[PDB]
């Protein structure tokens, strides 16, 4: 049982419901605003000093992230996020919340003229707090990478099959944590360095992640670097 301490997460008073609604909206802002490059909308999700971790970015502040994202546009980074289940753990005494947003990362790549997707199921974790004005903001963001897969875009062909089986060979896959191996191979081939100390549902960092989430709910200071 990774979450034995229960906070406000179902039912509750109207204020608690509304706070959980507002934090869920904040989290979904990643799927809605980042995919569409609605950058003012996106930046409103975060504290001014917020820190983000991604596969290809590693660690970033929020405008570090915004502009390395905008530069992802021209050298062919095409990433989308299907939101598929969002709920919130809320501590009204500390005004702290954890947003748990399940997503599929779907990234569209091209290898030797063949288009394909990599699809990675995961949990985005948003560490949120009310700022001095009563507005929820995300101070930290990190991802549990759960499972991933290769996805053809066109009808398969034996030609394309054997060209792609070369890049997604085992030897290239195992050098990355089980959970985001296909994503890592594909993004490496695009030329990004991979942050390989990212949490999955198989490795050490799982527990590190949940520990941070628990300390966050209790009102404590954390550091996700």
Closest distance of CB 47 from its own copies, Å: 13
Binding footprint of K ion on the chain (CB under 5 A) = 83-84
Q: How many residues bind its own copies (CB under 8 A)?
A: 69
69-108 residues in contact with its own copies (CB under 8 A) are 78, 80-87, 100, 102-104, 106, 108
C-alpha span between 142 and 123 (Å, rounded): 9
Within positions 22 to 51, which residues make up the interface with its own copies, using CB under 8 A?
22, 25-26, 28-29, 31-33, 35-41, 44-45
- 106 binding partner (options its own copies, K ion, none; Cβ < 5 to 8 Å by kind): its own copies
Residue with token string 């053809």: 152
Listed ranges 13-21, 47-55, 56-64, 216-224: which one lies at the site for its own copies (CB under 8 A): 13-21
Q: How far is CA 204 from CA 68, 177, 181, 194, in A?
A: 29, 11, 16, 18
Residue 52's φ and ψ, nearest 5 degrees, are -125, 140
Q: Quick one: 120 or 184, whose CB is closer to K ion?
A: 120
Among 49, 75, 132, 134, binds its own copies (CB under 8 A): 134
The DSSP symbol for 13 reads -
Contact of 53 with 61, CB cutoff 8 Å:
no
Closest alpha carbon to 176 in 206, 154, 149, 198: 198
CB of 4 to its own copies, least distance (A): 6
Q: Does 178 bind its own copies (CB under 8 A)?
A: no
CA quadruple 142, 22, 72, 80: dihedral, nearest 10: 90
As measured in angstroms, the least distance from the Cβ of 130 to K ion is 25
CA distance 113 to 208: 40
**Binding-site string for its own copies from residue 193 to residue 212, where x marks contact by CB under 8 A and - marks none:** --------------------
Look at residues 33, 99, 49 and name the one whose alpha carbon lies nearest to residue 223: 49
- Decide: 87 and 103 in contact? Cβ < 8 Å: no
The residue ranges that bind its own copies (CB under 8 A) are 1-4, 6, 9-11, 14, 17-18, 20-22, 25-26, 28-29, 31-33, 35-41, 44-45, 78, 80-87, 100, 102-104, 106, 108, 117, 121, 123, 134-136, 146-158, 161, 164-165, 168, 182
């Amino acid at each position: 049982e990774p979450w034995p301490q229960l906070y406000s997460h179902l039912n509750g008073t109207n204020e608690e419901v509304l706070d959980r609604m507002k934090v869920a909206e904040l989290c979904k802002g990643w799927s809605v605003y980042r995919d569409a490059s609605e950058w003012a909308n996106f930046k409103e999700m975060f504290t001014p000093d917020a820190n983000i971790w991604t596969t290809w970015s590693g660690a970033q502040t929020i405008d570090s992230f915004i502009q390395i994202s905008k530069d992802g546009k021209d050298k062919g980074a095409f990433i989308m996020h299907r939101e598929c289940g969002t709920l919130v753990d809320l501590n009204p005494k500390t005004q702290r919340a954890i947003g748990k947003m399940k997503t599929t990362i779907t990234q569209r790549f091209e290898y030797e003229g063949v288009p394909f997707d990599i699809d990675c199921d995961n949990y985005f974790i948003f560490f949120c707090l009310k700022d001095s004005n009563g507005d929820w903001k995300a101070r930290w963001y990190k991802v549990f990478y759960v499972k991933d897969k290769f996805v053809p875009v066109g009808v398969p062909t034996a030609e394309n099959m054997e060209k792609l089986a070369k890049l997604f060979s085992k030897e290239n896959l195992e050098q990355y944590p089980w959970g985001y191996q296909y994503l890592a191979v594909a993004q490496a081939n695009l030329g990004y360095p991979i942050d390989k100390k990212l949490p999955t549902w198989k490795n050490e960092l799982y527990h590190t992640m949940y520990d941070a989430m628990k300390e966050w709910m209790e009102g404590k200071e954390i550091d996700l670097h």
